[PDB]
């Protein structure tokens, strides 16, 4: 998280921390629990084999609170375009169910088919890198502003406001950055977006997947 402050421990019990095995190395993402056995994340956080971690805060400590679960399935969206990062939404189904409690229980998705409204302040969170050289052991969070879809249509070649949200004041140093992919964008304690891409420089605005544009496919999939 760029431009943020350390999150209060377990104040956000839906956060997942994904460890991903690639053909050539490892990748690390965030995600969020949307049902007691289901994690919502990004689709470019897919790997052959994915160890999920719930209920953590200091992710580099072997904590009493954490639950370490592997992903039974990794369901990428069928129309996910790798090249343009279009339809960047993946469901992870856990290999055993979580114990609901103080530090592990899901966040709500939106009621049918409402993305967002410009000007709105929302919160994104994750264990992503905080700068070009350092990362975090701990969950950190920053409060971003929803932008007018004009901004992104000028800067990103493949931005689609039907399925994506445009987020982040260009003037502030506030964004989600590397390692935050698949984290939730919360407004009113509802996950309206999934952290997806932006410029490599961290320079806002950046693009989130509009969760509510895939509500039919999420229910279907968990069914």
């Amino acid at each position: 998280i760029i431009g943020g402050r350390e999150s209060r421990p377990h104040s956000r019990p839906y956060m997942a921390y994904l460890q991903i095995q690639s053909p050539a190395g490892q990748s690390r993402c965030g995600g969020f629990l949307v049902r007691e056995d289901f994690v919502l994340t990004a689709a470019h956080c897919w790997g052959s084999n994915i160890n999920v971690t719930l209920g953590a805060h200091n992710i580099q400590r072997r904590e009493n609170t954490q639950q370490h679960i592997t992903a039974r399935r990794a369901i990428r969206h069928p129309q996910y375009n790798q090249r343009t990062i279009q339809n960047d939404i993946m469901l992870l189904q856990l290999s055993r169910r979580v114990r609901r409690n103080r530090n592990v229980n899901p966040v709500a998705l939106p009621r049918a088919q409402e993305g967002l409204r410009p000007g709105t302040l929302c919160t994104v969170a994750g264990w992503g890198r905080v700068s070009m050289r350092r990362g975090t052991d701990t969950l950190r969070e920053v409060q971003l502003r929803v932008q007018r879809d004009r901004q992104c249509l000028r800067i990103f070649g493949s931005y689609d406001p039907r399925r994506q949200i445009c987020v982040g004041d260009r003037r502030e140093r506030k964004a989600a950055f590397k390692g935050d992919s698949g984290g939730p964008l919360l407004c009113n304690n509802v996950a309206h977006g999934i952290v997806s891409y932006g410029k490599s420089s961290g320079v806002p605005p950046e693009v989130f997947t509009r969760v509510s544009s895939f509500l039919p496919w999420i229910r279907t999939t968990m069914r």
């Binding site: 190395g25 470019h44 790798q82 090249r83 992503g128 800067i155 493949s158 992919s181 997806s196 932006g198």
Partner: protein
């Protein structure tokens, strides 16, 4: 047994993922080897294939070393250096296509 972080930029956009290339610690490799991993992650992370690299206007990666130096390498240039380079001297890799 070491992790080298890399970033990929394709057509201006870059996924917000923390990506790592695994290397055996303290292992001397060449820039063919480095190019083949760069071509690898370009295909897996972004669907970017050799004919895509060829068709693009310019495609390169930059290796940032821990001694604050950098080396910038063009993927469409045929040229590369007959030097072995140490895995554990690499700080990070920036791919840009």
């Amino acid at each position: 047994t070491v992790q080298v972080p890399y970033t990929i930029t394709v057509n201006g956009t870059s996924q917000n993922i923390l990506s790592n290339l695994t290397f055996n610690k303290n292992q001397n490799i060449s820039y063919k080897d480095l190019e083949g991993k760069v071509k690898s992650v370009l295909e897996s992370n972004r669907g970017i294939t050799d004919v895509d690299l060829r068709l693009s206007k310019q495609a390169k990666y930059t290796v940032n070393f821990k001694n604050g130096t950098k080396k910038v390498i063009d993927l469409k240039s045929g040229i590369y250096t007959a030097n072995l380079i140490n895995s554990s001297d690499i700080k990070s890799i920036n791919i840009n296509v």
